[PDB]
UniProtKB/Swiss-Prot annotation:
First-to-last residue of the parent protein present: 180 to 228 of 611
Protein's recorded name: Endo-1,4-beta-xylanase A
Gene of this entry: xynA
Family, per entry: Belongs to the glycosyl hydrolase 10 (cellulase F) family.
Domain CBM10: 5-34
Domain of life of the source: Bacteria
Annotated S-S bridges: 6-37, 16-31
Native source organism of the sequence: Cellvibrio japonicus (strain Ueda107) (Pseudomonas fluorescens subsp. cellulosa)
Length: 50
């Protein structure tokens, strides 16, 4: 697979690649755009380390 996550200043959100054009809502929850998701600075960024 190859999904990215949003270490949101501490919280965790699923990345909305289609809504990567800003904040979006998918997965029956809130998804944060691509970069807005991970691109953010640390410790913000792409999460998903199983």
């Amino acid at each position: 697979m190859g999904n990215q996550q949003c270490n949101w200043y501490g919280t965790l959100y699923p990345l909305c690649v289609t809504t990567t054009n800003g904040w979006g809502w998918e997965d029956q929850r809130s998804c944060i755009a691509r970069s807005t998701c991970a691109a953010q600075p640390a410790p913000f960024g792409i999460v998903g380390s199983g």
